[PDB]
Amino acid sequence: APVPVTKLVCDGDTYKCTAYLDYGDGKWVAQWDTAVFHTT
Amino acid sequence: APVPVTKLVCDGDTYKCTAYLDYGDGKWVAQWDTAVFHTT
Amino acid sequence: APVPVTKLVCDGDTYKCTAYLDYGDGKWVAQWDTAVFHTT
16 A cells, blocks of 8 residues: 655665655655756 | 645555645646555 | 765756755766657
């Protein structure tokens, strides 16, 4: 079932965005590649 | 146009992360697969 | 290294979700396609 995100971090070095779910104790985390770049 | 997210949920059972946009009334929602696992 | 998201926007017209990282000054931003639709 859907669970609100307590914390959401991202990494540009690997383009991998991690997430912290509140499912259970809070150890489970999601990860999905995401393009990154600088914006003017 | 870009719209701030009022609510952001995720599902590990299906690896599908849902989102709630503030565009219009607030019925529109995004969805994108995302790997999930336990972290020590 | 992981960095908390200060702002998170999304676009349904292009299905592209943008993000604002706190890495450095705060110019860097992530982007990843995401399906969108209406929910009843």
